[PDB]
Amino acid sequence: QHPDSVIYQTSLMSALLSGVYEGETTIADLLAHGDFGLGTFNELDGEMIAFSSQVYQLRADGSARAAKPEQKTPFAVMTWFQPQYRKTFDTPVSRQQIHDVIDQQIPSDNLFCALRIDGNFRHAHTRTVPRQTPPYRAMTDVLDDQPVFRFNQREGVLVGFRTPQHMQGINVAGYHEHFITDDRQGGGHLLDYQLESGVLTFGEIHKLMIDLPADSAFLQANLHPSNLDAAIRSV
Amino acid sequence: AQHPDSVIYQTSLMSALLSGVYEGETTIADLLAHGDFGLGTFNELDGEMIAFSSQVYQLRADGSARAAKPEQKTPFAVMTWFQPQYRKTFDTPVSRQQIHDVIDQQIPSDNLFCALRIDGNFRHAHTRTVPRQTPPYRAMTDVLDDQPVFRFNQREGVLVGFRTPQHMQGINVAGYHEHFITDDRQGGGHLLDYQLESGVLTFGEIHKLMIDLPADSAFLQANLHPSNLDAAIRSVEN
Ligand SMILES: [Cl-]
Ligand SMILES: [Cl-]
Ligand SMILES: [Zn+2]
Ligand SMILES: [Zn+2]
């Protein structure tokens, strides 16, 4: 029937920031809820990117690997990607100009958006969380390997979600975009990028499923400090 | 299937309902597909909804607590298929806060949801039911105002409630949110406080939440991130 129009989420972003780095949600159980998405891995060991319908791990020492079916994640956002709009670019366009386009076709901030870009990127600045060790602290005071890596004139795939401003804490407020190269050898959490040329797929989503963990690490965590927003708009 | 369907469903949001969005097109019949248990309000804020044993009632500011009709529509509601893991009987008087103490002690983690139901005799109870609104649809803090507080005394009835994580304010009603109907099914409303004479409390925890965003233009243009939110919701729900 009517395709599965749901944002599935193993959660919370507030939890990931609180210091809950280990979940029991599997890559396999993620693929059950979509063919498309992003997130991280247990112990914050690099970035996850998922598309059509392949899961990759983007690690800290640069590099990237194909995700193994039974790896687990403390936070991930999946969906069956079914775009409704599309724009093609011949002239170079920035990350914001992409967001302008999407905002124009989907003005209401009260909805979710899934977006995918396939093309050649003139520049791209990324960050990538490094594998952690106990005691698991916040996602601030990382260590801080948040050094900014730079890609140049690389072909690749972009995967992203737009999350309502009022949903911060639950997910990443605003645009959250991940990147992997056509080689599948590099990428990460995008801070900014600019497109030389490419194809932008996107669509709005109205349904959100949140899967709250049952492990003690999640159960004992305080997910309501009034710090949050500047802390997450810092990852 | 093989795995329990224990999910908190809502047609949303509380911030949307607060902002002034008073009409959705989710029907009562739609809600029942997502639970036999729950609460909320009706379109044009026409009273309170309470659901238990898949029976749906409309609690009115009017006071004419009537049985809801399957085609009736709601701008906000919370449902679940009630599957309690705990049962507790009270032989001596206990307050709303003492009942909350029981639940908070058995389910200490605030990061999960709780569904709660009480059958029995209520010594006292205070309710406030929202009255049917006309345009311009306003923020719930604007109260215009047929929202008096009523006191029920020595009434048998059914209580239906949810406990929502403190960090999900705006999405739902943070903390304890409870509705009440008399054994008469002719009275009740949104609870502000209550005192249980004696009765049976059953409750359980839920790890899954399903949010269903409407597509109507009123929802699309509503401000769901006001500086007002937290205190405003708590002011409207006490
Ligand atoms: Cl991330
Ligand atoms: Cl309500
Ligand atoms: Zn990211
Ligand atoms: Zn209520």
From Swiss-Prot, chain A:
It catalyses: (2S)-2-acetolactate + H(+) = (R)-acetoin + CO2. One of its GO terms (molecular function) is acetolactate decarboxylase activity. InterPro entries: Acetolactate_a_deCO2ase. CDD domains: acetolactate_decarboxylase (cd17299). Its EC number is 4.1.1.5. Transmembrane segments: none annotated. Converts acetolactate into acetoin, which can be excreted by the cells. This may be a mechanism for controlling the internal pH of cells in the stationary stage. Belongs to the alpha-acetolactate decarboxylase family. This is Alpha-acetolactate decarboxylase. It comes from Klebsiella aerogenes. The lineage of its organism: Bacteria, Pseudomonadati, Pseudomonadota, Gammaproteobacteria, Enterobacterales.
From Swiss-Prot, chain B:
Pathway: Polyol metabolism; (R,R)-butane-2,3-diol biosynthesis; (R,R)-butane-2,3-diol from pyruvate: step 2/3. Its EC number is 4.1.1.5. It holds the Pfam family AAL_decarboxy. GO terms for biological process: acetoin biosynthetic process. CDD domains: acetolactate_decarboxylase. GO terms for molecular function: acetolactate decarboxylase activity. It comes from the Bacteria. Keywords: Acetoin biosynthesis, Decarboxylase, Lyase. It catalyses: (2S)-2-acetolactate + H(+) = (R)-acetoin + CO2. InterPro entries: Acetolactate_a_deCO2ase (IPR005128). It is an enzyme of class 4 (lyase). Converts acetolactate into acetoin, which can be excreted by the cells. This may be a mechanism for controlling the internal pH of cells in the stationary stage. Belongs to the alpha-acetolactate decarboxylase family. This is Alpha-acetolactate decarboxylase.
